[PDB]
Design an enzyme around this catalytic site. Structure first.
Site, PDB file in Angstrom:
ATOM      1  N   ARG B 373       0.820  -1.207   0.000  1.00 47.60           N
ATOM      2  CA  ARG B 373       0.000   0.000   0.000  1.00 47.60           C
ATOM      3  C   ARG B 373       0.857   1.261   0.000  1.00 47.60           C
ATOM      4  O   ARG B 373       0.538   2.229  -0.699  1.00 47.60           O
ATOM      5  CB  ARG B 373      -0.941  -0.005   1.205  1.00 47.60           C
ATOM      6  N   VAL B 374       1.942   1.268   0.773  1.00 44.42           N
ATOM      7  CA  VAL B 374       2.832   2.422   0.843  1.00 44.42           C
ATOM      8  C   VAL B 374       3.845   2.342  -0.291  1.00 44.42           C
ATOM      9  O   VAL B 374       3.636   2.915  -1.367  1.00 44.42           O
ATOM     10  CB  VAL B 374       3.536   2.501   2.210  1.00 44.42           C
TER      11      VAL B 374
END
Ligand SMILES: Nc1ncnc2c1ncn2[C@@H]1O[C@H](COP(=O)(O)OP(=O)(O)OP(=O)(O)O)[C@@H](O)[C@H]1O
Ligand SMILES: Nc1ncnc2c1ncn2[C@@H]1O[C@H](COP(=O)(O)OP(=O)(O)OP(=O)(O)O)[C@@H](O)[C@H]1O
Ligand SMILES: Nc1ncnc2c1ncn2[C@@H]1O[C@H](COP(=O)(O)OP(=O)(O)O)[C@@H](O)[C@H]1O
Lengths: 466, 508, 160, 466, 73, 73
Positions: B373-374
């Protein structure tokens, strides 16, 4: 099987099938393991109450049968739950499924009489270091580092057999380590007991092993109740100073009796034809064979998978509950060797990695890389020709054939059955000889004189003296 | 007297004008080892805990008239049909508090082996909910995963939500054992919920994890095979008890989860033994609750959420809840409702290949299947701007080199996938207990990105170039450590890395 | 129509409720309350009620109201719990279950129901059934004595 | 609110979570699941009676469960059926559940509450707009053209591909229209309110659209309460103005909550615990909200399939009850394309011969024949290799690989989520470029020159300049 | 077999039909088209085997001919 | 019907029944109304049984079916 104190309880109600719905006492029900010895017919048929209910009619299940009973059989109250007779004096004759015998008299050595429900897994006073074991062989201990008191799995087909493991393990492990190695059996044949027992007269193990088998002529509750004899009888020797080592037969009796009895009682469970009690029995029973401070509790995990069923609980429970799993094919025994266990797919996690030492890492890396890198030079190159055979084909074929055909050292199984000696293979000869002389050094040993040699210690004098 | 109740049948059939069953106690009608019907309890709360015979918090299922289904913790087969219960006050009284880090904590409370004394803040709620809409901002911060490609490619910060899965019998529970020693402190008190352990896992994991690093800031609550409904299936939902003392206060909160699907069988008793409904492998919709206020609450707080959840304590800071849950995949077994709901309820998904994880290679991460996600949002200047193209090496080398055994990819163009392709992809892999930080990403991405330590580097040249260049450059220069203090990607990184790498690697 | 629910109403009221001299209230209350709704008015009009106070208080206190604590408590608990919808075996189950301490009833000798006062085995059945008095009645007593020899000889000897 | 008086439903006797049963008198039941104000443990909660019964104890349906409440707490209800908000006044603030405040600002809306059900036109009053809309890409704008008024169903949930298609489709469709909308939004992530709502709520994009919030941490009744808020604002805003578009997503809560909530309320199941009224809710909810005479409603549906569940009622119901039947296959996203969408599943109605043209007919026939022959020639070109191949394998593989690998391109939001840049293509280069790259004119390019290319400018400039 | 049994033509000897009993009931054809819209030829249920086996005609189509590029299906 | 093979290789009679199984998104309901110019233009007393429709099905089917030659037939 419980200690009756009072003999009261009450009458009964319904008796359809194996559901023992007898109305004993009103507000005086017993425990789970406290069975009620009811006088059904002539014998005292006890029924284990799996789930108590109000009123008196509890959900009980008996082992055998009532041998013809009426609708109002008189029951009896008990006090001590699961009061059977066992102890450390069971190594002398064959045992039964209720603490009695199956061969001669004496109830498989009558000694102590405590609780039949032993403890599963525990810590605190238990050994949490998990030390390694040594069976004393060049193709069992040097190729797979087993733990002291673990449930090592087994695979493969034939080749070794029960006579090689029982005869070779009943003399080397019994003299090399203090402890009594017993056995079990649930789901066997009625004729094998009249033949396999004769093997006990060819290796002298009947006086040091308690054969507790239930055959298969009984039902599920009468033949699958062999868990109290092994856990109740094996705890008296492992927690005193010796090391107990049981041996299971198969998983068809526990899986078929547990799934059929647990799923055919009118309740839903797991999927794919399984029951919901597999995680409790497999996880609680698989973790109970651990090392302790007074002795390691070892057990031969001889579970049988359902024809490699990855979707059922056999591959997940057998592959996730056990530790190392050795396989024995027909290729190692069809050529005419002693040990049928091959070196491929027969090691643990701490036997080939960097969690042992230079001996196990160098011997496992050299034997695994030499066997895997040399197994293709004699099988895949046979379809073309031997014209392109350089130093790698001759050195790898001679070292792989001489090391593979000479590493199978004979134990004490053929010393009192066939006549061949060998005693026991040490770890210094198999760990300090198969990594240097079995790669490209001292190429004077052939194929006929190198056979029947104890690891690499007896193979040095055979190259110049024979 | 329709039903046979002896006392209640004759008393209720002979004197129905006096009931007196409003004390929220009484006794039980029957006990079938777990499924016990609590008689009476007209004024008792539905779902509240009550101490019955022994030491177990028996909570009722629903409030269906006076026949409430009580579930006691542990086996109740030895007791008779008629256990007397007490009053049902209120449930959700677990040990909440971030100050109990260091001691041994179990799933039953604060008593375990061997330290049974853990001072917490107080027994409060454990099943925490999710955050708000505008008051739920993700905090971008740097952290060390364990390898150069993991910390430089997918740098997960504090408060992210990604899915991780490992291969069976290859390294799904250990693998990177240098995370506690290389990461030191994970912000605050750490946690790791597990289901299925013994003496070898707790002794080897506690001795190996505690002997190398700091184990005084981690409160892992694992479980063995003898676990009930509140110790196996409720292990991932009750793990957010102390988070309110860390995430909802001003600082961050570290948490972990191992073997989440293995406890799903523990829910079978709520679908098979309770005569409910079935779905996937005899399981109802209770797993869907894990997508509500359980696994979906792993989000970092914002600036306005720290002043309302703490009743005025931070006023300017932002909380974070870094709860990275992992699972043990059965040779890539992720195609059901748990993989779709768990992988779709968050924003990250990572998978580990079983080809190189069991063949002896240290690189267990798959190429192209890791989508966090990051990634480049929580990274620094030396991992997002200079080392942002980490997928081109594995994707271009694996896709260009795995062309069904091809000849040569334009000869020279194949040098990055055959000649020098193993010096930046196969050589940069963390093995057994291998620490990694900003020196591996900054030194391996700021010097080996042109041709100083990436052109002539293969086997002997790759090992001797990285060992001689890293030892001579790391032991001769002292300013390189400054690269681990700030971001990077400036004239000092190119001049110091190029001059120190070229001068220190030119005479190997 | 209780079957399994008939053992609690007959066995629970003949032991704990027998100490209050309730041997005559159960027969009149159970026979009057159970037999008073055997027509086509009180059963369909009282069994289709919404609450239990109207059916129990109206059916147990409006048709004679010859009950006390056992009638109101048993009618309210049985009507509110679901047992007053039939109650056909209350007289036979309560009389046979409550009168089991001095139950003396024999069988029939292929004729009519004599019902002798024999509490044990071969008590008064030999003297009452063999000490005439009565030897053969008009219910095919003497004519049914040849069924054993005629049926046994003809049926057993009919094969040949 | 406005009487909203009396009620008096009594106390809850059988509270089984969401399906409660509060017995009372004879006149204590809702009218077709009306509103209520039961004061359980928190405040006045709604309790719509979905199934009426006698005695007052009806099968009520609430949002939360009955945890914490006792079996004797007296509550009440309401007399009004629907009393929420339906208007264009609450545009800058998100509507919470019915129409409260979800974001930072407070939402009020119109005070005149209408019906809680969508009502479309008849068979002679539905103004079906046949205007073809083009996207900002090449294959999406040149392959098929969706018309206004109809909702294109897009199967496939999150976890594999949803943000790439929803971000580029919502950004390109919402930015390349220049009009009014009325899209809401429920069932998102926990941290989506500070990233997704900040751009649309802070970039002056939700100034004329009634947006809404809602994460996945809601209950069973709270996640399935989007029928009144969506049908009220969509039916009122779609008929009270000129145009009102929509973009519904997250169909997992409606299918899981609607299909799984029927088995826990006393009703029977259907397909592995499904609802028996899928045709009425799917057909009525998907067919009762289209373009009417008062205004066009060009909505956008998005079916959430679990792990590509194309064999359930969402594919069969959405493939025939809506406009297009798009999907998200794993072959497009697993290969590393710039589209990650299943374009070979279904198309629109403007891709035949009369309303299409020579470009769509020749491109669809050549792309379908080349893609079907090249994609279906794996049984003779994959196992046998390139031994028994000819011009069909090289021409079909080069035309299908070049057209399929070059037809994908970014679309603003699809450009920053990968790595390549974003360029808006046209219809002349994409519609006219299929007769040269798949024929022999522009077939001289390679595999690297066609990666991440728009139409003819990126392929001709990248293939001719590099 | 009851409601779907009206797929047979009558003869000229039927005096009933509509008017009794001469004309208006001679050559009375009653055709029926059982074109079921299956899922790409999905026919493996009780209604498919009973309805397809209880009648007399049988036909099927495929999506490869209409989706490959040809006009016939 | 409307094709060349439907009148010689697969012709049906007046008063018989023939089952068909069209594929999905190929020739299910589109081939039985699109390629039926002889049955709709020749003049026959047919009866259709439509189950499950909407505004697009009634508008497109009524406009396309009524704008050819059938309409009121
Ligand atoms: N990438 C890797 N390369 C080489 N060895 C590895 C790797 N990952 C883990 N290992 C080895 O695995 C050992 C730890 O295994 P671990 O106990 O995690 O297995 P496990 O997760 O219990 O297996 P299972 O999931 O089947 O129960 C370590 O000693 C380490 O040497
Ligand atoms: N006779 C025909 N020949 C070739 N193509 C046709 C013919 N009839 C229809 N088509 C094609 O079918 C497409 C329209 O399909 P349509 O949407 O009507 O399928 P459908 O009726 O929804 O399928 P189903 O009934 O299985 O749901 C058009 O694009 C057209 O190209
Ligand atoms: N055109 C594309 N090219 C390459 N990768 C893409 C493309 N579109 C999407 N992806 C990848 O797909 C992933 C989708 O992640 P995420 O949004 O969390 O799941 P979902 O798309 O199912 O919601 C992203 O990590 C992104 O790297």
């Amino acid at each position: 099987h419980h200690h009756h104190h009072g003999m009261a309880t009450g009458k009964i109600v319904q008796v359809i099938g194996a559901v023992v719905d007898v109305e004993f006492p009103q507000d005086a029900v017993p425990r789970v393991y406290d069975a009620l010895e009811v006088q059904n017919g002539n014998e005292r048929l006890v029924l284990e109450v799996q789930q108590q209910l109000g009123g008196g009619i509890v959900r009980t299940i008996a082992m055998g049968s009532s041998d013809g009973l009426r609708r109002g059989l008189d029951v009896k109250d008990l006090e001590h739950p699961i009061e059977v007779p066992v102890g450390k004096a069971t190594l002398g004759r064959i045992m039964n499924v209720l603490g009695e015998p199956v061969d001669m008299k004496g109830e498989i050595g009558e000694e102590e009489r405590w609780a039949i429900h032993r403890a599963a897994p525990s810590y605190e006073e238990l050994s949490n270091s998990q030390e390694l074991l040594e069976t004393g062989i060049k193709v069992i201990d040097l190729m797979a580092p087993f733990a002291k008191g673990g449930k090592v799995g087994l695979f493969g087909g034939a080749g070794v057999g029960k006579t090689v493991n029982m005869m070779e393990l009943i003399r080397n492990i019994a003299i090399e380590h203090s402890g009594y190695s017993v056995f079990a059996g649930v789901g066997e044949r009625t004729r094998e007991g009249n033949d396999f027992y004769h093997e006990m007269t060819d290796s002298n193990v009947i006086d040091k092993v308690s054969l507790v088998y239930g055959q298969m002529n009984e039902p599920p509750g009468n033949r699958l109740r062999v868990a109290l004899t092994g856990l109740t009888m094996a705890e008296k020797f492992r927690d005193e100073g010796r090391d107990v080592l049981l041996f299971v037969d198969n998983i068809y009796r526990y899986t078929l009796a547990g799934t059929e009895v647990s799923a055919l009682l009118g309740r839903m469970p797991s999927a794919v034809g399984y029951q919901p009690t597999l995680a409790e029995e497999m996880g609680v029973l698989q973790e109970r064979i651990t090392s302790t401070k007074t002795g390691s509790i070892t057990s031969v995990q001889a579970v049988y998978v359902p024809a490699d069923d990855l979707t059922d609980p056999s591959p997940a429970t057998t592959f996730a509950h056990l530790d190392a799993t050795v396989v024995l094919s027909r290729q190692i025994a069809s050529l005419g060797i002693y040990p049928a266990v091959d070196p491929l797919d027969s090691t643990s996690r701490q036997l080939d990695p960097l969690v042992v030492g230079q001996e196990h890492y160098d011997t496992a890396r050299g034997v695994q890389s030499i066997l895997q890198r040399y197994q293709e030079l004699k099988d895949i190159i046979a379809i073309l020709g031997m014209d392109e055979l350089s130093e790698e084909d001759k050195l790898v074929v001679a070292r792989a054939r001489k090391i593979q055909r000479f590493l199978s050292q004979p134990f004490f199984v053929a010393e009192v059955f066939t006549g061949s000696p060998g005693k026991y293979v040490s770890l210094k000869d198999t760990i300090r000889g198969f990594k240097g002389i079995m790669e490209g050094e001292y190429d004077h040993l052939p194929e006929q004189a190198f056979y029947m040699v104890g690891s690499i210690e007896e193979a040095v004098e055979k190259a110049k003296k024979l | 007297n329709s039903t046979e109740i002896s006392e209640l049948i004759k008393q209720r059939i002979a004197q129905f004008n006096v009931v007196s069953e409003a004390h929220n106690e009484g006794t039980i009608v029957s006990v079938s080892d777990g499924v016990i019907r609590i008689h009476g309890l007209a004024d008792a709360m539905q779902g509240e805990m009550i101490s019955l015979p022994g030491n177990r918090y028996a909570i009722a299922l629903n409030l269906e008239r006076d026949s409430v289904g009580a579930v006691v913790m542990g086996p109740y087969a030895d007791l008779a049909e008629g256990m007397k219960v007490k009053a049902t006050g209120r449930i959700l009284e677990v040990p909440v508090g971030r100050g109990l880090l260091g001691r041994v904590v179990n799933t039953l409370g604060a008593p375990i082996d061997g330290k049974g004394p853990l001072d917490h803040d107080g027994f409060s709620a454990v099943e925490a909910i999710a955050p708000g809409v505008i008051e739920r901002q993700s905090v971008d911060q740097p952290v060390q995963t364990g390898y150069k490609a993991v910390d430089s490619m997918i740098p997960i910060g504090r408060g992210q939500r990604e899915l991780i899965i490992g291969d069976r019998q290859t390294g799904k529970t250990a693998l990177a054992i240098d995370a506690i020693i290389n990461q030191r402190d994970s912000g605050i008190k750490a946690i790791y919920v597990a289901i299925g352990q013994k003496a070898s896992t707790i002794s080897n994991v506690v001795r190996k994890l505690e002997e190398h690093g700091a184990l005084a800031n981690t409160i892992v609550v694992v479980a063995t095979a003898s676990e009930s409904a509140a110790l196996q299936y409720l292990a991932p939902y009750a793990g957010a008890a102390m988070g309110e003392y860390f995430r909802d206060r001003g600082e961050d909160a570290l948490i972990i989860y191992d073997d989440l699907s293995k406890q799903a069988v523990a829910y079978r008793q709520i679908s098979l033994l309770l005569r409910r409904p079935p779905g996937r492998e005899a399981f109802p919709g209770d797993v869907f609750y894990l997508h509500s206020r359980l696994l979906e609450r792993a989000a970092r707080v914002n600036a306005e959420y720290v002043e309302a959840f703490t009743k005025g304590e931070v006023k300017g800071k932002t909380g974070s809840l870094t709860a990275l849950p992992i699972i043990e995949t059965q040779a890539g077994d992720v195609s059901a409702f748990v993989p779709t709901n768990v992988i779709s309820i968050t924003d990250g998904q990572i998978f580990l290949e079983t080809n190189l994880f069991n063949a002896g290679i240290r690189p267990a991460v798959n190429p192209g299947i890791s989508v966090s996600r990051v990634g480049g949002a929580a990274q620094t200047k030396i991992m997002k701007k200079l080392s942002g193209g980490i997928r081109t090496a594995l994707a271009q080398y694996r896709e260009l080199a795995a062309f069904s055994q091809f000849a040569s990819d334009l000869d020279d163009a194949t040098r990055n996938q055959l000649d020098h392709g193993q010096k930046v992809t196969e050589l940069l892999k963390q093995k057994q207990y291998a620490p990694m930080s900003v020196a591996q990403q900054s030194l391996v991405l700021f010097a080996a990105e042109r041709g100083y330590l990436a052109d002539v580097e293969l086997s002997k040249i790759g090992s001797f170039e990285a060992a001689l260049l890293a030892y001579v450059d790391r032991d001769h220069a002292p300013l390189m450590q400054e690269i681990n203090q700030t971001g990077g990607y400036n004239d000092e990184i190119e001049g110091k890395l190029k001059g120190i790498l070229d001068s220190f690697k030119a005479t190997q | 129509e209780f079957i399994t629910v008939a053992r609690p109403y007959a066995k629970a009221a003949f032991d704990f409720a027998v100490e209050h001299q309730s041997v005559e209230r159960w027969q009149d209350m159970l026979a009057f309350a159970a037999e008073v709704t055997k027509n086509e008015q009180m059963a369909e009009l009282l069994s289709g009620a919404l609450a239990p106070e109207t059916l129990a208080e109206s059916f147990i206190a409006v048709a004679g109201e010859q009950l006390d604590e056992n009638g109101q408590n048993l009618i309210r608990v049985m009507a509110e719990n679901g047992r007053l919808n039939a109650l056909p075996d209350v007289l036979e189950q309560f009389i046979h279950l409550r009168a089991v301490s001095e139950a003396t009833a024999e069988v029939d000798v292929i004729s009519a129901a004599a019902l002798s006062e024999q509490q044990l085995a071969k008590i008064s059945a030999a003297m009452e059934k063999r000490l005439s008095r009565k030897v053969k009645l008009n219910a095919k007593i003497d004519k049914s004595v040849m069924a054993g020899v005629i049926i046994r000889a003809g049926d057993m000897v009919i094969d040949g």
